Amino acid sequence: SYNYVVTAQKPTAVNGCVTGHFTSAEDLNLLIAKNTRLEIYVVTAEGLRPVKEVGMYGKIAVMELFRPKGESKDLLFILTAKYNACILEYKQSGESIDIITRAHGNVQDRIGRPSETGIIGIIDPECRMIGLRLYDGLFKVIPLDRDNKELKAFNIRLEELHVIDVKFLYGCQAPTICFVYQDPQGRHVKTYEVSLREKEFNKGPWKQENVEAEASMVIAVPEPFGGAIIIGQESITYHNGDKYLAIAPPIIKQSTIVCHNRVDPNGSRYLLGDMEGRLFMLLLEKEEQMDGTVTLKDLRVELLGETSIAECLTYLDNGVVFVGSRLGDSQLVKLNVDSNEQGSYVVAMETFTNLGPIVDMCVVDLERQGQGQLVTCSGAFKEGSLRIIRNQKLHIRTVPLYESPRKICYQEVSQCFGVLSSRIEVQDTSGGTTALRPSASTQALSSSVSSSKLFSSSTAPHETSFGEEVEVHNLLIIDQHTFEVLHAHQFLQNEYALSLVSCKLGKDPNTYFIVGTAMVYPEEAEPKQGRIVVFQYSDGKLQTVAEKEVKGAVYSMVEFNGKLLASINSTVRLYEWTTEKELRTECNHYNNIMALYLKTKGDFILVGDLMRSVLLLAYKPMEGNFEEIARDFNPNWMSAVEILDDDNFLGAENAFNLFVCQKDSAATTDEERQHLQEVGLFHLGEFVNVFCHGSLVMTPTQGSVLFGTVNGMIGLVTSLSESWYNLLLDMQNRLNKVIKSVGKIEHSFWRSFHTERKTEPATGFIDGDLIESFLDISRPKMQEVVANLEATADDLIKVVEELTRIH
Amino acid sequence: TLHDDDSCQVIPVLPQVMMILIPGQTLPLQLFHPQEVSMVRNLIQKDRTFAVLAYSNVQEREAQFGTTAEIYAYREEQDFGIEIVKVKAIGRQRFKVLELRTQSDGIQQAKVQILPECVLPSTMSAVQLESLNKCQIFPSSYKWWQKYQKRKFHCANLTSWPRWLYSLYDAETLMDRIKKQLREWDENLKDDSLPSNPIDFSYRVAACLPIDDVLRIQLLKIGSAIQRLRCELDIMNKCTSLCCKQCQETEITTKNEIFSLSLCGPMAAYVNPHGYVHETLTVYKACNLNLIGRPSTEHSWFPGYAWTVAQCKICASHIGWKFTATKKDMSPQKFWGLTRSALLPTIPDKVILCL
Amino acid sequence: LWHEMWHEGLEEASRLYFGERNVKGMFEVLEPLHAMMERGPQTLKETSFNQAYGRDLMEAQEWCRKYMKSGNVKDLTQAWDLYYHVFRRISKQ
Numbered sequence A: 001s002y003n004y005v006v007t008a009q010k011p012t013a014v015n016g017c018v019t020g021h022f023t024s025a026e027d028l029n030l031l032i033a034k035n036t037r038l039e040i041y042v043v044t045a046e047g048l049r050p051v052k053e054v055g056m057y058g059k060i061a062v063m064e065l066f067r068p069k070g071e072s073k074d075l076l077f078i079l080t081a082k083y084n085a086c087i088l089e090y091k092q093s094g095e096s097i098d099i100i101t102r103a104h105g106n107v108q109d110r111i112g113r114p115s116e117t118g119i120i121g122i123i124d125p126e127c128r129m130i131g132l133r134l135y136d137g138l139f140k141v142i143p144l145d146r147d148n149k150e151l152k153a154f155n156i157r158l159e160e161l162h163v164i165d166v167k168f169l170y171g172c173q174a175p176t177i178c179f180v181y182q183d184p185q186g187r188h189v190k191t192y193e194v195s196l197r198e199k200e201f202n203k204g205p206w207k208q209e210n211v212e213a214e215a216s217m218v219i220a221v222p223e224p225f226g227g228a229i230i231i232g233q234e235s236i237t238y239h240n241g242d243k244y245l246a247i248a249p250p251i252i253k254q255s256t257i258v259c260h261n262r263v264d265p266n267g268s269r270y271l272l273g274d275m276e277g278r279l280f281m282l283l284l285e286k287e288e289q290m291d292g293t294v295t296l297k298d299l300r301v302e303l304l305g306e307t308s309i310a311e312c313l314t315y316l317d318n319g320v321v322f323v324g325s326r327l328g329d330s331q332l333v334k335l336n337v338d339s340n341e342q343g344s345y346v347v348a349m350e351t352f353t354n355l356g357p358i359v360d361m362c363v364v365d366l367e368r369q370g371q372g373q374l375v376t377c378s379g380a381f382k383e384g385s386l387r388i389i390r391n392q393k394l395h396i397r398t399v400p401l402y403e404s405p406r407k408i409c410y411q412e413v414s415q416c417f418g419v420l421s422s423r424i425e426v427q428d429t430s431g432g433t434t435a436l437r438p439s440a441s442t443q444a445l446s447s448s449v450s451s452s453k454l455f456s457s458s459t460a461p462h463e464t465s466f467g468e469e470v471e472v473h474n475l476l477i478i479d480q481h482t483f484e485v486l487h488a489h490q491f492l493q494n495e496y497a498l499s500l501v502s503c504k505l506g507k508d509p510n511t512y513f514i515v516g517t518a519m520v521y522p523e524e525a526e527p528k529q530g531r532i533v534v535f536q537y538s539d540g541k542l543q544t545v546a547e548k549e550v551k552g553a554v555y556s557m558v559e560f561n562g563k564l565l566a567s568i569n570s571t572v573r574l575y576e577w578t579t580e581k582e583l584r585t586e587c588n589h590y591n592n593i594m595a596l597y598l599k600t601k602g603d604f605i606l607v608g609d610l611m612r613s614v615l616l617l618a619y620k621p622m623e624g625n626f627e628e629i630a631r632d633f634n635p636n637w638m639s640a641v642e643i644l645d646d647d648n649f650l651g652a653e654n655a656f657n658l659f660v661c662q663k664d665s666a667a668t669t670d671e672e673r674q675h676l677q678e679v680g681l682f683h684l685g686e687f688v689n690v691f692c693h694g695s696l697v698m699t700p701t702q703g704s705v706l707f708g709t710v711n712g713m714i715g716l717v718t719s720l721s722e723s724w725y726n727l728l729l730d731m732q733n734r735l736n737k738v739i740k741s742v743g744k745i746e747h748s749f750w751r752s753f754h755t756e757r758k759t760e761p762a763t764g765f766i767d768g769d770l771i772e773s774f775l776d777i778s779r780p781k782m783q784e785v786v787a788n789l790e791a792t793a794d795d796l797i798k799v800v801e802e803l804t805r806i807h
Numbered sequence B: 001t002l003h004d005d006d007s008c009q010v011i012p013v014l015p016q017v018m019m020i021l022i023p024g025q026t027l028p029l030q031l032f033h034p035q036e037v038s039m040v041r042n043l044i045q046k047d048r049t050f051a052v053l054a055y056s057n058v059q060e061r062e063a064q065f066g067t068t069a070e071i072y073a074y075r076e077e078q079d080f081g082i083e084i085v086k087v088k089a090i091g092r093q094r095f096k097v098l099e100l101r102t103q104s105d106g107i108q109q110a111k112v113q114i115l116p117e118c119v120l121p122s123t124m125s126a127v128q129l130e131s132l133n134k135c136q137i138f139p140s141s142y143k144w145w146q147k148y149q150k151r152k153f154h155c156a157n158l159t160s161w162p163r164w165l166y167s168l169y170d171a172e173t174l175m176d177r178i179k180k181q182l183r184e185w186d187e188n189l190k191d192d193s194l195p196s197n198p199i200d201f202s203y204r205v206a207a208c209l210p211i212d213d214v215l216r217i218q219l220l221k222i223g224s225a226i227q228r229l230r231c232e233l234d235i236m237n238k239c240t241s242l243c244c245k246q247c248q249e250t251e252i253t254t255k256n257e258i259f260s261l262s263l264c265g266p267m268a269a270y271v272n273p274h275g276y277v278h279e280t281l282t283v284y285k286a287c288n289l290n291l292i293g294r295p296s297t298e299h300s301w302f303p304g305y306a307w308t309v310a311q312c313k314i315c316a317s318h319i320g321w322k323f324t325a326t327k328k329d330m331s332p333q334k335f336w337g338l339t340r341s342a343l344l345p346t347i348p349d350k351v352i353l354c355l
Numbered sequence C: 001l002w003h004e005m006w007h008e009g010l011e012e013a014s015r016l017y018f019g020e021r022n023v024k025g026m027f028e029v030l031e032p033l034h035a036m037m038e039r040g041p042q043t044l045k046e047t048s049f050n051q052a053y054g055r056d057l058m059e060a061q062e063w064c065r066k067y068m069k070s071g072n073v074k075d076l077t078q079a080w081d082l083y084y085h086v087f088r089r090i091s092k093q
């Protein structure tokens, strides 16, 4: 099998943002990292002026700016998830603009397990070295000096194995690190000096101190203060060589502070964001001395307002703050001196679209022209919403829900979408549960609730704890034209909605919304009860038609030739819709794995679990039971699966990879007829949550599968012929010899299948983005690529422009 | 000695061993022939590792699988002039058999491919937000597990699955659930006695479950420790009826009757006078068992108790023994002891086993 | 040899197990006689003895081996039933 993978919408989720002087010394820049993309802007007081946007062959993990002594502008350091390090420089040749790789080199080790807190990348203030913390027990040091083009580094043994955060201190004669670590005694702050000549750790400027057992971040305060600030769940403490000051502000106890940014270059003010969108400012009050020295007088924290759930923050000129958000739209906010008539000092100025995370989606034709439009379940918590993507090229419309959407399906006969959603409520003294804010499930025109005395759990005393978050699930009906929340049906207490399907069954004319749920209780590890509720949308309200009680979680459901096929724990059960509007068990097939994923094409069904266990089944009419055709048990975390054709199955497995399994051609054998050979391997660099058959356009390529990712990237996979794959595979090796990669990262090393303890070259996949880049190069370069292998530059223009038409 | 995986390595084979050994199971050996002394002494000064062979069809010498066993102890008795090598070994890595050659001295050397131990990372490592990386270190029981799940699997909101599903594939949660189930059978179980590593814990549990040889083979075929833990936990919840192996359908006892009389657990290995080893499972009550002969205290594995042979009421196959107390003050006055090799784990009223 | 030998070895093995209540002594008398059968017949009377008794004698040894593992006295009784069937047929001549 041979496939062509191309990006339709680039990743929108922001994972990093920094400010500095990268393009010139006289311009203030704003650099934004969006997984594999880097955007460069110039702050001018009227907003952000786009200047340069590039793509890298790697998942940007670290991104920091620094200015060595001899440099006129700032240099940019980037480390990737595959440990590709590079020092970059912005170069403008009048009209042409180019990112230059001053230094580069892979910094991974042959041994060592990735650290628990992930990659930490810090640069010394006086640009003497780059410190990296990749594995537990080691601290990699890349010495910063002129002729170090290969980014050669050395490792220093670190005794403290469970380091949470680390930073380089300011105003120190020798490079000094300050970090928090956890040992069986608790958490502690410690300092260490780094001597490049010695290649070892010397004693730090101040002795080890104890911190809050929940201390999570370290902020090195620039001069005149020096020292460091340790932030935990309930305390903010300062520490330097001769002083310490601690505060326990009750205004921070509701949520954990997880991101910070410095406002004043001297460290007088610092913005702080939590997991729920609250934005705070920390003031380092100063008591100046007669000799110009400054001591820390007191610490004060004040809540400013509400922003989108912030991943990273960056102060820009005059009250303007950029809010990078992984879970919602990124923003440009204004920090007003006087509060508005609501009480917030923060006011939104601009909103930047963020599809990420895409949990589910579907393709639908609404204006009824022939062009399919994608409707995704995006965001989470207050950022949760629906996004309609149409074919600047892609037009996006947002429908805010203020709660987490989970599943989506389109009902043609009702002109409305069905969306499973969840809202967080908290127990109150009254004895019930109260919601944090109004949302789609609480603002519907009409609402309904489930009832079930017959579904009383035995081991559940229902003595729910006080002040505990409770997740309430609902099924929302949303109009396809106005997108208003028409109806909201709440499920039973402790009931978790998992699967959703809209279909007709048997001889019944009525299309129904069917939901597969699970009864989740804290005491029970695995659900022992579940429900398959059938719903009919009539008179702008949802009415239950049939309710079937099952002994397990209904992880997935699908329409199978007029019947309902559901997956309850390990069993794959088929049901028939009788003339009395009831579900009746037709047959059961017990599997040896958890039936999480369930797809069907024709008479065969694909079953999968979270550990990439793929088993094929076929419903035999004579037997009245299912039969295993083939199986592959290659243990690895699988996030999504899809049937490409009768003998090809596309999936997404751990370390942001795509794979295709093929059914053997039955070459006078039986043990290989039940074996699925892996023919496709590719490192996408995105975490796929959903595959979807369909297209957004009005046949050299066979088939069309769209997919949504955590970073909001939308991609497309299509099959190719034998002759078409070899020509495009030849053109990739040719384009890689000419195209200049930012950081000088080889395309073969970026797309090769990679896991923590395994790496193999990519097979059966064509990087469509690389092929489409051929058109975006100068005419003399276009001919350089097609030199020999007959095939002129002009001939390969309509070939690539034909592949462009697919998306 | 832990050789590289997915590579074909030649390992010496011990001729007098034809029994399936689970990684990390005590196998005391007592060799005597000089053909099994000059090789056991050659390995002691090189790598200290011999190969135990598993035969699917013991009657036709069909060997397609096996597991290595590192030599960790050496003692040589000079009794009556005849050299006796007394060595104890422990199982390390599973291997597959491809081709076994025969030498001209009396040893077989086979090129075996070591099947990898698939160590997967955490399910949240590829989806954890960088801002929340610093919230993964928990500071240092029913409500503690609720907060453990709520914090470790918080990022499940970015995927298509909930937090409770990810707990079903979490090594720490699975091992804790198995420990609770094992505690029901052994009130005298010590936590320090069980390994903390998911690889060693899974193999230790596989050698403690009262299951037939076919199921022991199935668990060893599994490559990941997560799937092996899940299958072991599924056996404990579903295979509640223990039946006679020969009859396949005659029930003998139930899971709820399993208990531990001594401090070696509910199914310890004991050796009879003739030297045969019996992994004996102790239960309070049994059905379809007839008693043969009279009680005897000779060679009793449990002090203060007399044994009486027990057999299948339908097929007359040996199942184990009944233990009657000699003193009227012993609390478990009467209990049963069943040899593992005589029983068939069965799922009562057909569901199968999940990985 | 073989006839009078097996005959005199079963009388002594019965006197040790039934009379003296000593399993070890009985197996000591029986083991060499069974080992002789494993070597094979080398005389006509020896060959004639393996044709009629050989199969019955090798099954009582398997029943003795079953007792050594199980510890079931009935398995030794099954071996002794076969030993007495052969002992009587030997006594017939």
Ligand SMILES: COc1cscc1-c1cn([C@H]2CCC(=O)NC2=O)nn1
Pocket (backbone or CB within 6 Å): B271, B272, B273, B274, B298, B299, B300, B301, B302, B307, B321, C067, C068, C069, C070, C071, C072
């Ligand atoms: C003296 O016993 C024998 C003579 S021939 C075989 C045996 C024998 C005894 N056992 C068990 C019975 C139960 C027990 O507590 N200890 C054992 O050793 N298994 N086989």
Ligand SMILES: [Zn+2]
Pocket (backbone or CB within 6 Å): B244, B245, B246, B247, B248, B250, B312, B313, B314, B315, B316, B317
């Ligand atoms: Zn039986």
